[PDB]
Amino acid sequence: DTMKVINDPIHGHIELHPLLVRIIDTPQFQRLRYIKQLGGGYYVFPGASHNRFEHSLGVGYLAGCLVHALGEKQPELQISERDVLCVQIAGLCRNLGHGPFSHMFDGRFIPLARPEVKWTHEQGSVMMFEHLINSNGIKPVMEQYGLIPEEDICFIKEQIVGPLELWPYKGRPENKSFLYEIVSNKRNGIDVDKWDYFARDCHHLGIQNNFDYKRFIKFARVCEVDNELRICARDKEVGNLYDMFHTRNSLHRRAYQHKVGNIIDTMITDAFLKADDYIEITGAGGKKYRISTAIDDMEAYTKLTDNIFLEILYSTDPKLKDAREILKQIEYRNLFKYVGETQPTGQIKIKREDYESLPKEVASAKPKVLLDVKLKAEDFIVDVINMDYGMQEKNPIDHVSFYCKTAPNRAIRITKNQVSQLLPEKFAEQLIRVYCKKVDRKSLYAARQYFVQWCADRNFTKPQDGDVIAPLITPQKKEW
Amino acid sequence: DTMKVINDPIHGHIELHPLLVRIIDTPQFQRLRYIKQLGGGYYVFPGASHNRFEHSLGVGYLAGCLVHALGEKQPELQISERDVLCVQIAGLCRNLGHGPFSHMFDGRFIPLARPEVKWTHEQGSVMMFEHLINSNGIKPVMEQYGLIPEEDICFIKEQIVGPLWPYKGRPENKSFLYEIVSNKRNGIDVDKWDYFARDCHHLGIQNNFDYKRFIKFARVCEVDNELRICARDKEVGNLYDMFHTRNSLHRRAYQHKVGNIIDTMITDAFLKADDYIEITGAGGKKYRISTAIDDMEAYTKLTDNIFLEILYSTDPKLKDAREILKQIEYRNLFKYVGETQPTGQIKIKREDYESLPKEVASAKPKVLLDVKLKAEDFIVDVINMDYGMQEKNPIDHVSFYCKTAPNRAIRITKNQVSQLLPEKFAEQLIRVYCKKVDRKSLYAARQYFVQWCADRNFTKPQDGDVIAPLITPQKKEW
Amino acid sequence: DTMKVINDPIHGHIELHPLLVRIIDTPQFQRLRYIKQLGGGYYVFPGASHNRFEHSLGVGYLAGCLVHALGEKQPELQISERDVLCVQIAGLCRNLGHGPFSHMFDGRFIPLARPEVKWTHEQGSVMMFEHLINSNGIKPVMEQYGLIPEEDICFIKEQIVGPLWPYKGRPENKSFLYEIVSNKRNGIDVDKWDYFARDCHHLGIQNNFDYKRFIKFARVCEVDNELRICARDKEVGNLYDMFHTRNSLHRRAYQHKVGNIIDTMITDAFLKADDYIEITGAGGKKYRISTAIDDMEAYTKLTDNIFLEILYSTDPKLKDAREILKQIEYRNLFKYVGETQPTGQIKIKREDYESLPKEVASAKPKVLLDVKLKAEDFIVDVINMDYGMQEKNPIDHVSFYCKTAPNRAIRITKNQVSQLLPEKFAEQLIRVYCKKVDRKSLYAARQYFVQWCADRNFTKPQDGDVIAPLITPQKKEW
Amino acid sequence: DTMKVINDPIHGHIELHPLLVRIIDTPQFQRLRYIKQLGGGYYVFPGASHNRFEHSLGVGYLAGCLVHALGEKQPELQISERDVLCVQIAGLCRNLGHGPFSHMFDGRFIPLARPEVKWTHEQGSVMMFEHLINSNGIKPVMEQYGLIPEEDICFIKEQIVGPLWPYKGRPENKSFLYEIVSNKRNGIDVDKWDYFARDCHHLGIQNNFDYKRFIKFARVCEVDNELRICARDKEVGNLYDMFHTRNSLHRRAYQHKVGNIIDTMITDAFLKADDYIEITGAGGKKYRISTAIDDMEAYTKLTDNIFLEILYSTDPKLKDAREILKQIEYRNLFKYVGETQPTGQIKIKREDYESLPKEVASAKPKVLLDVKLKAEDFIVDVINMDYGMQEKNPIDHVSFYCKTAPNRAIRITKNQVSQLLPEKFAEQLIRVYCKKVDRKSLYAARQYFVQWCADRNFTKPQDGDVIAPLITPQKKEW
Ligand SMILES: Nc1ncnc2c1ncn2[C@H]1C[C@H](O)[C@@H](COP(=O)(O)OP(=O)(O)OP(=O)(O)O)O1
Ligand SMILES: Nc1ncnc2c1ncn2[C@H]1C[C@H](O)[C@@H](COP(=O)(O)OP(=O)(O)OP(=O)(O)O)O1
Ligand SMILES: Nc1ncnc2c1ncn2[C@H]1C[C@H](O)[C@@H](COP(=O)(O)OP(=O)(O)OP(=O)(O)O)O1
Ligand SMILES: Nc1ncnc2c1ncn2[C@H]1C[C@H](O)[C@@H](COP(=O)(O)OP(=O)(O)OP(=O)(O)O)O1
Ligand code: NA
Ligand code: NA
Ligand code: NA
Ligand code: NA
Ligand code: NA
Ligand code: NA
Ligand code: NA
Ligand code: NA
Ligand code: NA
Ligand code: NA
Ligand code: NA
Ligand code: NA
Ligand code: NA
Ligand code: NA
After folding, report:
1. Does residue C145 sit in the same domain as residue C218?
2. Bridge partners, A387 (sequence order)
3. Quick check: A288 and A299 in contact, CB under 8 A?
4. Whether residues A329 and A346 fall in one domain
5. Does residue D154's CB lie within 6 angstroms of at least one atom of ligand 3?
6. Is the separation of the CB atoms in B382 and B353 below 8 Å?
């Protein structure tokens, strides 16, 4: 077994070490071929047919490019061949825990189906990796290539999920601290997983990427920052890092939080909720699990993919009728209808515990307009979206270290005022989208009146088309 | 009316007329989201995750670009808005009849499972379109936009599948319209243009054909008393390059030796599953994977999903099918032994395919072997590579015009273009694989293979001297 | 004569009407082949070899795309063939007035060589267009294609340079036409769209603005009793991104610290050569590099070639000029010391520029230095970065329409889009360089520089702590 | 001094070792910024503004990629850091000897102006490199980085121009290194790889050769007791495609019929200017355009600028030269009459070129002509199109390895790959143009042309029946 070459449209011809090949050629990894990267986004951007499989190869490749580049420029770090493989494997395997339609599954479905548990795709990746290792005899193969399974497995899992609970990591000592910033960077969010999905999502969506990850890799260095070795960027690149998070935000606005993409993810979630009692997935020992409990058994979870959508759509059982009809509505494009978008003003934040009550508030509004129909709470969906630069209210560039041309081993900080006055003043905000489940012309007219009146009552921002969709409501609000 | 815009990575922002949107928003069209364009190719080229859905939008768009371009340059053709919509709809709908894994289903599975029937994806598209029309109340919507369903449905179906003037959907003065979506005269059509661009974007191989350039130089002229789409004389080199590119894409990607063996293993799994999977069709009647083609309501539910239904099954009756698919996941694939071609005049006929594994196993290589292999251990895959018209040069069926007389159609022969062009336009490739994957079986398989090539006067395999050093010295030609 | 087709790597195959071809095939237009789009940027980004000629073809093409798109969607605007040609011509001709190294010539050279005059490339374009028309017998060719030279020439010139309705080339009901080539209201025009795509292709930085998407959503609506080009409401995010991209391109490429210092050195060489180079104009009268702008026949011969005329000269009078250009070839450039910005209300006005090198040399660092530097050893470059309208948000001057009422124009404020947008739309950068390149001079230059930043309450330079560790602790702030 | 990074749109961010930087920052290298890669091609493809400078950086970078790749995969070859630098330097410097408009200068101008000498851009590069080294003190800088100037300079020059082992710069065990920059065995080298990608990016024609794939599969193996670079067996298809692409680029772009006639007109202007332009060289001695090749200090100043020096001149002695250049700006070009090829064994040798205009004018068409044309009215351009090795298949000079024995070199014949490949590897194109551009002259020129083709048994011109309907019936073949 020798180096395989694989041709990827984003990165070109990528070399895979035979241990990587052994990890890839398992049911646990190959599963990612059946999970769309962008979930319901495929129903809006028809190029976005790519799956988590190819994204994962790309993350593994880029993780290897960055660690190899640091090792060649700085031999004094003592990056070993073993370190390189562990970083590549962690890159490959950080997407293993994703579920059907990717963010739909851990962002919408699981929190509604199992409100008592705290599940992330990260934790799932660690569990799925363990199952991959143990079911496929990977440990003897790791030893053959010089890995020490005990320590290296721990290292790999820590790169995915952070400390498995003073230097908190066990897989590598503090002098290799920089290695924990490559695959999943908890300090500031700058990591190779974003770099792959920027390039890959853009190629498939038909929106062009402005971030240059190769340029970043070339200027990257390891320096001592508060007695820990960290990956630092060249001072000059600070503009480009602000542009990188600006790009992330553009991709969320244009594509990932597309108003129709989100409502399709919501409809799929609702179909999976109604189907949950009746779909059975066989796991370890022949025990049966549901869509919502497959996360408790990795053998069941292995078989939980986008296929669930089609199993529901093609079913004939009367018990799956409600689930199936929601999916049929997607095919006919009879979707829940977008009413509009607003934001809170001032320092007002809408917290997760208030979400359920928002459809009630929209239906409780009293627009002074003659209406043919009256709508209820259950007729409205309210979707609250938190947009930020990856670290809630914080500027992630405040957590980046830099070096200068004249002293490349000396780490420095650069503040927002030292770069530009044209940068954002805040780093987080909320969007509120409202939709109506009643699609007829009179219901939709009514829904707009309730919506705009609610925006006025709550002192939210004037919807962009407020004057067109509710001309009788927007004059009562002086500031509009 | 109300145009939708859709953003496609190949063509940019595409406008869809509301009638097209009505056709697209049906179970019969949306089904194409679950059929991979390149089938088992995704298992070799990981970027090739694209489905028939997006390819079909692109063919519809390009069909519209070509017909609009001809109408603007030549008002005298009388291309109406109705013609434009019919051509776009036929473009949209020519892929409706594809099955699971696209060419796998009509190229491998159906010919083995139903050898007596003559099924093509084209005929399937016509049948699926009829079912799409009748199940979704499309005829009143056609009338709303000025189409005449009787004539226009006939036109649309004829553009997909073909037929004194033999067509009924349009008269002879619109003969050129039949050359846009599916060109029976020479193979130059908008379906190829979309898949060249789209497959290349996804495979990571760069496309060298410029379809926009071609559309700009295209004109309709009278050729033997029939109006045809002609190309500019100067463009003749680019058309030879276009078929050269098609041939490269087949060699590099579509007939990739591992892509084909994965399609073969999936076919074998579907054969072993065929008795046991049921698909519900019209009136609750049950169909199999091999009979779903006889009922469009069943066939609607026949997609790549079948692969996962088999892979995830627990039924003991699906065990053999499921194990073949598990072999694909572990990459325990049937092993490639090699490739050869016939020499001289020799062509291998379709009726002799079944007997070829027997001939390879019957060869007597003078090498000491620890295993003996049988007929069933060999797969022999014969691939016909051509320029789309068997042995014919398709450029002999293209008409050209000159700058100084743009309504005068001419012919250009291969001799008038270049001496560096192909001398033949068709050939066969013979790939041999072994179902026994261990190192000793594979060694043995190579000896039988090379010996068979020697016995049959086939070409010396490229690695012949390395894989069978004891066999290749007997053959003086090599 | 009929349509020429030209293949451009940015836009593909572009069609040129024969009148445009006649305008392009003149010495006044073909001159733009010898003026680099990005001037000294080519000396930093080696892909940036592109010239104004191809950019101008692209602007003419995109001007035609937008006016055609508006006309097809809204026949009621009565856009005539004549309007289309005049808009395409204005698009083609808006770069005619550029000088050697593009922005170097009107941004640095002319203001220093002729401080008393107010010259812009725009005014130059109008004058060069008039000369192009009259020297090449274009007026009878305009008449042949239905143009009325009196009104249409006026229209074309007004589209490039601007002026109760103040325009004479078209009445108020065609007011939207003045927003295509050079948009005075908000800066959204086709010239930006071409240079975004073209500069990005050549620089190796990828463009994220989608101009085609913008064209598809564009409509003309009534706004305060005047017809204007409006954008779809949803696209407002993309317009903010468009100016954000313009700003990124300025930071990364157009105001690159070494690109600018190369433009400065070339400017200095042209100043020292100005007394001695002669350019023959109309009548045989002689002009200088700085006076060629007063005679279009001389200016026709004033291109990047002047750089090489100086570099290859042997005349002893051009020695000092030639030596500066030789320093560029050896890469012995004036050295970058650093960058800072003003804080608070502080704005640095154009009348204070000359005094800044004096202030840096007057600073008293409080560290012992081996050499002392003077005013002439420093260059101080002030760069104004904005969104095209000084302190104003250009999106406040954009009109929008909604899906439910496409003829009804609306306004959208910054708070209705996002909290993550910029709070200001203008700022200044100050770069300092040193003409003395040795290690001791450069160390000293950094101490003066950082101390000056401290004295003036400017921002702490990014590398302040590394380049001047003894100076940055004295500032209660840093 | 450490690595510079340079951003190139084709290769991305490229690292330059400080010795390379020292070679690049000289007047001898920087001169390549003023020589267009494609010469007159820019006058047809407006994207083709790129210069030899950036192409050279790219060849240097790719030379380094291939030698690094071989060294990492095969440590037993003992590729040193010194070898890597010498290979990068040879890559950087192989284009130094190009003249104004690249192939125009050594392909057209020099053969006509200096018929007694045998000059190539290769020999020019060696001479320019020597001058670069000696004028800029590069030898001590080479020693600083471990190079041995005597041996390594010889190595570098041998990699550019060529020579029982005939080379002195490296012994036989490093023989593979001579195949990277300029491969005399088969033409597969990094210079092609860069211009495929770069010319395609600028021309707007898409490249289908994947050089990175090739580098990944490349290995060094023993072939007839010499170490050589071998390709993987199954890449053989791709190598045939690589030369097919080279040929397509020649047909579409580099031998464009208008590109070539513009190169011819520029050559004619330079011939008429040759007596009157002076270029100052070493010791103040004066040279002409045609003698600047004999003094590297003069040749340093000989660039595309010469075109504009002629165009902008006022000297009455340069009038005829200047008028030809003015005709290019107005697009009053010599007119294309047509294209033919020889049939049979007939090859047209360089000594018969001068007589061809005479033969066309001597033909006796037998139709009534209003004007009669003479020899000097015709230009006949003979173009040799091949796969880089005259009549030979360059793939017969490629060595391959198989997966099962990667140190064992093999040969692969054309019949082992495909029957759809070219049957010949060389041909000639004959283009005829007319210097008289009026309608009557052009009609006459076509009659003479077609009659000449008939008399000589050349191929029927593609538009023969349209341009000469009365002449093409006499010829039974046609
Ligand atoms: N000619 C080609 N150009 C571009 N990519 C290719 C081409 N041929 C194959 N690929 C892609 C498909 C895969 O992603 C990757 C490797 O394919 P390939 O080299 O065919 O390996 P293989 O594993 O089938 O052969 P082998 O095992 O004999 O080396 O390159
Ligand atoms: N900013 C963007 N840039 C590029 N593509 C986009 C952007 N926004 C959306 N898309 C894509 C997704 C779709 O394929 C296509 C149409 O999207 P969009 O204009 O959002 O339609 P819509 O149907 O959601 O809006 P509406 O119905 O309100 O007009 O363009
Ligand atoms: N095969 C090609 N592919 C892409 N671009 C090409 C090709 N051939 C030429 N071009 C480019 C060069 C020009 O920019 C544009 C038009 O050139 P071309 O069609 O050769 O026109 P022409 O003016 O030389 O021919 P004619 O006058 O006979 O129509 O296309
Ligand atoms: N932000 C950017 N994105 C892409 N390319 C850039 C960017 N900045 C500069 N370039 C280009 C121009 C050059 O070709 C190459 C290197 O430029 P740059 O990093 O600016 O070097 P420099 O020599 O000016 O800086 P220094 O000497 O301070 O390291 O990259
Ligand atoms: Na797709
Ligand atoms: Na990590
Ligand atoms: Na530093
Ligand atoms: Na058809
Ligand atoms: Na082509
Ligand atoms: Na073929
Ligand atoms: Na296949
Ligand atoms: Na597999
Ligand atoms: Na052939
Ligand atoms: Na709207
Ligand atoms: Na260009
Ligand atoms: Na070179
Ligand atoms: Na060179
Ligand atoms: Na060998």
Report:
1. yes
2. A429
3. no
4. no
5. no
6. yes
| CATH number of the domain where residue C215 is located | 1.10.3210.10
Cα distances (Å, whole numbers) of residue D21 to A234, D37, D141, D160: 21, 22, 11, 20
Type and span of the H or E element at A73? helix A52-73
- How were these coordinates obtained? X-ray
Kind and range of the H or E element at D241? helix D236-249
Q: Collapse the DSSP code of A4 into the 3-class scheme (helix H, G, I; strand E, B; otherwise coil) and give the result.
A: strand
Same domain, D313 and D337: no
Cα of B93 vs centre of ligand 5, distance in Å, is: 17
Give the resolution in Å.
2.3
Domain boundary among B300, B332, B364: B332
Give how many domains chain C has, as a whole number.
2
Q: Pocket of ligand 1, candidates B38, B44, B201, B247: which has the most ligand atoms within 8 Å of its Cβ, to mutate?
A: B44
Ligand nearest to the CA of D227: 18
A-chain residues near D7 (CB < 8 A)? 215
Interatomic CA distance for residues A472 and D344, integer angstroms: 87
CA B85/CA B64 separation, integer angstroms:
8
Domain edge (last residue) among D314, D332, D350: D332
Q: Which ligand is closest in space to the CA of residue B196? A: 9
Active-site choice (A55, A121, A131, A204): A121
How far is D432 from D335, CA to CA, in rounded Å?
Answer: 9
Residue labelled with tokens 């853009």: A202
* Sequence-distant contacts of A71-80: CB under 8 A, at least 24 apart: A73/A221, A74/A221, A74/A222, A77/A176, A77/A178, A77/A222, A77/A229, A78/A175, A79/A176, A79/A179
Coil, strand, or helix at residue B181? coil
Q: Which amino acid is at B388?
A: G
Ligand 1 pocket residue status of A21, Cβ below 6 Å: no
C-alpha B45/C-alpha B199 separation (Å) is: 10
Whether residue A356 sits in one domain with residue A294: no
Q: How far is the CA of B130 from the centre of ligand 11 (A)?
A: 29
Domain of residue C130, residue span: 1-332
Instruction: Answer for the pair C435, C444: CB distance below 8 angstroms, yes or no.
Output: no
Task: Measure the CA–CA gap between B213 and A299, rounded to whole angstroms.
Answer: 53
List, as one string, the DSSP characters of A152-218.
HHHHHHHHHHS-------SSS-GGGGGGGGSSS-TTT---HHHHHHHHHHHHHHT------HHHHHH
Q: How far apart are CA B156 and CA D472, in angstroms?
A: 43
User: Would you say how long chain D is, in residues?
Assistant: 478
Helical packing angle, B236-249 and D236-249, nearest 10°:
160
Together in a domain, C313 and C346:
no
C-alpha to C-alpha distance for A191 and B254, rounded to whole angstroms: 35
Instruction: Report helix, strand or coil for D460.
Output: coil
Is the alpha carbon torsion for D155, D157, D161, D166 positive or negative? negative
- Alpha-carbon torsion B115, B117, B122, B124, what sign? negative
Nearest Cα to B58, choosing from B110, B22, B94? B94
Single-letter code of the amino acid located at B224: D
Query: What's the CA gap between A112 and C177, in Å, rounded?
Result: 54
> Is the domain of C303 the same as that of C443?
no
Determine phi and psi for B16, rounding to 5 degrees. -115, 120
Taking an 8 Å cut-off on Cβ atoms, the answer to whether B5 and C216 are in contact is yes
Backbone φ and ψ for D113, nearest 5 degrees, come out as: -80, -35
A346 and A247, same structural domain? no
Amino acid identity of C163?
A: P
Residues D311 and D440 in one domain: no
Mark whether D55 is an active-site residue: no
Sign of dihedral through CA atoms D315, D319, D322, D323? positive
For residue C385, the chain A residues in CB contact (below 8 A) are: 422
